[PDB]
Amino acid sequence: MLKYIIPTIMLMPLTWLSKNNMIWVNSTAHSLLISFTSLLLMNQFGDNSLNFSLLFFSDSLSTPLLILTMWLLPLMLMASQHHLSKENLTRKKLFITMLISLQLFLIMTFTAMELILFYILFEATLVPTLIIITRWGNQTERLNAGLYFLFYTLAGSLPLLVALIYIQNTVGSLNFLMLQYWVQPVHNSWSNVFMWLACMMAFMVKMPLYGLHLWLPKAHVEAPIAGSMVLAAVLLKLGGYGMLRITLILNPMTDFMAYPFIMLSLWGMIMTSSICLRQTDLKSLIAYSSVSHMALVIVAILIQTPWSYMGATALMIAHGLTSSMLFCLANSNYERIHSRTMILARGLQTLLPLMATWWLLASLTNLALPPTINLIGELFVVMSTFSWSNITIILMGVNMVITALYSLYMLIMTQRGKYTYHINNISPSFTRENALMSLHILPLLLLTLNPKIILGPLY
């Protein structure tokens, strides 16, 4: 992984040593080159994972998450450089540095062989994320959002640290390959119940699990646009990636310990989907949409079937591109009208025709139109959950109806009807904005041609 870690680190001197007026050009160009080389991680084998060294490895689960991560950095630089245009040079460079450091921690997080190396980098991502939210967020609420983000994550992750060290003392190793062969079944005792919760709650909070999600509508809404993109696209998926890994050592206890969290997710997805119908803040609506989608990933991971694991991997990738696109679309309106209220600016299809096409495509992927990879992931999860219990099709079916309703409600409210008379500063869409949207949707639809590369290790 050093062929990706070292180039990522070099983005920092590149940013600091660049000419003042070339910081965005230079960092964007070279971050795209790194993203291009990440395609070499697609050398996956049917039986064995691609094991680089004692520290790092990549299998079909981490590889797509790595490619998404490295793809997101140039998109975030494009999304940020407009609203940071009046920031002074040194603070711009520090903003880019936080983004680079977050990428460094993420790519090492997804390839860490040892769960305690995974833990340190998994917590490490908090620091740059907190700084981005609180320093460069726009509203007073960013300070409160940072505290909710920080202490929800740590309340869960500190018990995880105790559990992981306990496992290493008992097994002798936290190396993930070793745990595949030395894993022992978990006896059903009270002490193992709390080991199970310690190993899972930190990941549940990051998903987020319904009930433990209050940090997300604060953090995702108060962050700057780059903060929201990475928060929704990648950082929510650390929880899914962590759960997909750690459930290996929790069988068979997951059979019954899953029930309370499956109920929270199956009912929670309907609750959060309903909330979207009455949200007044466009960014807040998009944030609650993420909670509903990640409820499917939680359920898929907990029922532990080959189909649910393929579906979960696809959804995580599909949601990452879609939710990031929606935040970027919402941000482009915000940079014009300087409000997040959804009813403020209406009929934007009349004033911004091409941008209204991006809204439509973003909405259709969000409601999982076939054959998008959003639908492929959702379908595979619904199939596996039907086998877990036929009755689940009712909750899955209702959620798909509600999801269509709020996805198109967002489209209709903002893009259709009559334009707001007094809003007269809706200038034409910039080339930058149009390129930013198409760099989300084009890869998303291309993956429909070759879905296997985002179906994970069970494929």
Binding site: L351, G417, K418, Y421, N424, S427
Partner: protein, 171 residues
Amino acid sequence: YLTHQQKVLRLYKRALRHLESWCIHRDKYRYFACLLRARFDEHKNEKDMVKATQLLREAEEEFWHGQHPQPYIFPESPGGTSYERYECYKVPEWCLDDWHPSEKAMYPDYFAKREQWKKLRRESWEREVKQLQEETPVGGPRTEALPPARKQGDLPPLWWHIVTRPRERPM
């Protein structure tokens, strides 16, 4: 607030329109339109305004009982089949300010004319604001009526968005 006379005349127009929806055929409608007018003429002269109010309330109850459940609506009236059909084509004039110079060069005459209108609006604005300040009581305006221009070379205050509004068939 609607006066009593306004309430009666609104009822008469509503009653006739629903009557027409029932009758359909023109000769049949002419017949019953004249019977309905005769009913209104029967109490045209009713000086007692307490009794004229009672007649009005009963007529409205009779109307609600007799209204057509699916009355005729002019196509472009609210609730009609073409209501708001062309709003998607109505673009505000301020959008022309954002046209690229190569797009403006295709209509040099239109945009030269447009600059004269914008100059006219700029030069009138201070006088329009002043006229409203001086003609408005201290508490503030008590109705939504706007005044005309009192002088020569003055424009009626707050004219721009009325005069320059999109055409009903903009495209």
